Ligand binder design. Structure first.
Ligand SMILES: [Ca+2]
Ligand SMILES: [Ca+2]
Ligand SMILES: [Ca+2]
Ligand SMILES: [Ca+2]
Ligand SMILES: [Ca+2]
Ligand SMILES: [Ca+2]
Ligand code: NA
Ligand code: NA
Lengths: 345, 345
């Protein structure tokens, strides 16, 4: 590993607090003989110091000309300009929403792997960055809902009075939605999950939530109306549904939100692509007819040490495929390597 | 009840969102024949509307000249100027920290009852406003700690990696501290409670927390040092200890806080009286050597519907003592009435 240098930059995006490698993971790479260069204050968002990285065997310095640069968010034009020809870049590279990025990296002679493009196969389970970040997001979505609510989540019997538990509904039960159900349940909520994919029922039940069953043309309208009616009954509604490269599916109409009791909260995780809720204002928290509608845009950044640690393990699992005793040598017959590389033509 | 008018003002204090009666409680008073006047937008902080109050039988109007005015925070000079002679005022009246208030109310010919001065006796269990508000505060303290942490609270085993649970320590286990222990446990933390009163051990254990045992002159120093060392081991530390009318007890030294791991959080509930933590900046969240120190000043206001509902039940339980078929007639031979009245000389 001594001839291979891995570079970790500070994330430049507004509000970002994650860093692509954390000191514990850097320590493992150093122990294997790889050289790691970490940009000064790269870990500052996650409350790490430069000394933490140096203790893990890194040097503090310019990360951009490394043989392999590992980062979180897509690189800016100015960042790409600093990559050296023949290098590898690993990170979220927005293959759907930033298609020019692939072109730019190819022109720069950088071989680049998009973490979003890691295929959903058994061998890649440890490399699934979309899932690790979504786990953090689902957990923090519940904390945000509970923090904005005007009411307790758990049932409590106090000397002053008794209160019923909150009912929480999660719409879209992928990784974030499942973690939201689990976290809401921990906190004492009565929980219900809904997803257009029927096979998700088992997962919803496995975390102790009720599976919402609604009951083609005039039937589809009865269904939409049944979903709208169901939403009005909940104190906390968390929406998570995405379509890669497309607007977020509309799941919470204006009427549904308006029909919720005062002090209820809708936590819409889909704000970057338009929101699942018609009344969502991306990146803001607003009140509509006494109902709080909030649209966090980067929940992983709000819990940045564990978001970064999990992400770092995802990135290093992929990197381990790319490394041989000879240094950096991606095997393009490996499905994971071929599927995630955005620069190969 | 038809000849007795109860007035509910909008709280004027910066950041306050509670209201002394909520619509559900107003409904009960109306049903008994009492007239209730609620100031317009009094419930707006808790997301209630004027229509909610009118539906509960209230009229919307000037609350100050009522026979009984019920409010949350101590009245300002201008508010006192609007009370009518011969009226009753019930609320938090800061008997320790605002002694002139009693004098001012006496001069105004108002008979005033401080909720802080409700005696801690069996008959007054339903009237304990300090406790109901502290329950809300302990719960919201944990949500705030978990929201500021850079790490998960629960142990999780994910495809990306496993994380250990957070350890939470609560210093001062009265009502807020006990609810903080219970809430942290719900969320998945390993919990420990500490209090200078030994009899609190049973309460700490009853919520599934470990009781911290530390081990006169040089012994007291060994104890302080043992507490300091213990604090460094925790991911979330919640401090709640108060002395009525005096500075908050110092429980977390600068060294203790500094010795905590990066991304750990200290949630100090005692900021209004100086803070339990030496590094606390009242009403702010700061970072010191990678450790987050936060000092919320009004956690009840952050969950205002249930804080107000419980408070409303406390206030109305006292009010029921003061009411007879004849209207307002406090019996000063009743220990609760005599102990809580601050204007009687
Ligand atoms: Ca080299
Ligand atoms: Ca090194
Ligand atoms: Ca390898
Ligand atoms: Ca009258
Ligand atoms: Ca009336
Ligand atoms: Ca009575
Ligand atoms: Na409901
Ligand atoms: Na620890």
């Amino acid at each position: 590993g001594s001839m291979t240098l891995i570079g970790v930059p500070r994330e430049s995006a507004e509000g970002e607090r994650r860093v692509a490698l954390v000191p514990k993971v850097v320590e493992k790479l150093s122990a294997r003989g790889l050289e790691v260069v970490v940009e000064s204050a790269a870990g500052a968002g996650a409350l790490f110091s430069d000394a933490d990285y140096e203790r893990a065997g890194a040097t503090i310095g310019d990360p951009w000309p490394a043989d392999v640069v590992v980062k979180v968010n897509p690189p800016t034009s100015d960042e790409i300009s600093q990559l050296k020809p023949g290098s590898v870049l690993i990170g979220f590279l927005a293959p759907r929403t930033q298609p020019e990025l692939a072109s730019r990296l190819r022109i720069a002679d950088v071989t680049a792997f998009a973490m979003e493009s890691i295929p959903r196969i058994s061998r890649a389970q440890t490399m699934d960055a979309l899932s690790s970040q979504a786990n953090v997001a689902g957990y923090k979505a519940v904390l945000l809902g509970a923090s904005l609510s005007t009411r307790f989540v758990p049932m409590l019997t106090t000397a002053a009075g008794t209160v019923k538990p909150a009912s929480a509904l999660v719409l879209g039960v992928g990784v974030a939605g499942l973690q939201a159900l689990a976290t809401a349940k921990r906190l004492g909520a009565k929980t219900t999950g809904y997803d257009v994919r029927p096979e998700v029922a088992e997962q919803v039940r496995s975390v102790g939530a009720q599976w919402l069953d609604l009951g083609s043309e005039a039937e589809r309208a009865q269904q939409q109306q049944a979903l709208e009616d169901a939403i009005t009954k909940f104190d906390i509604v968390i929406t998570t549904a995405l379509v890669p490269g497309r607007p977020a599916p509309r799941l919470v109409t204006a009427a549904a939100a308006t029909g919720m009791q005062p002090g209820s909260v809708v936590v819409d995780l889909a704000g970057e692509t338009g929101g699942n809720c018609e009344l969502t204002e991306p990146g803001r928290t607003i009140v509509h007819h006494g109902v709080t509608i909030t649209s966090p845009l980067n929940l992983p950044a709000t819990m940045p040490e564990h978001a970064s640690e999990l992400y770092a393990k995802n990135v290093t699992a992929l990197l381990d495929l790319l490394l041989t005793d000879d240094g950096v040598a991606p095997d393009f017959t490996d499905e994971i390597v071929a599927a995630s590389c955005i620069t190969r033509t």
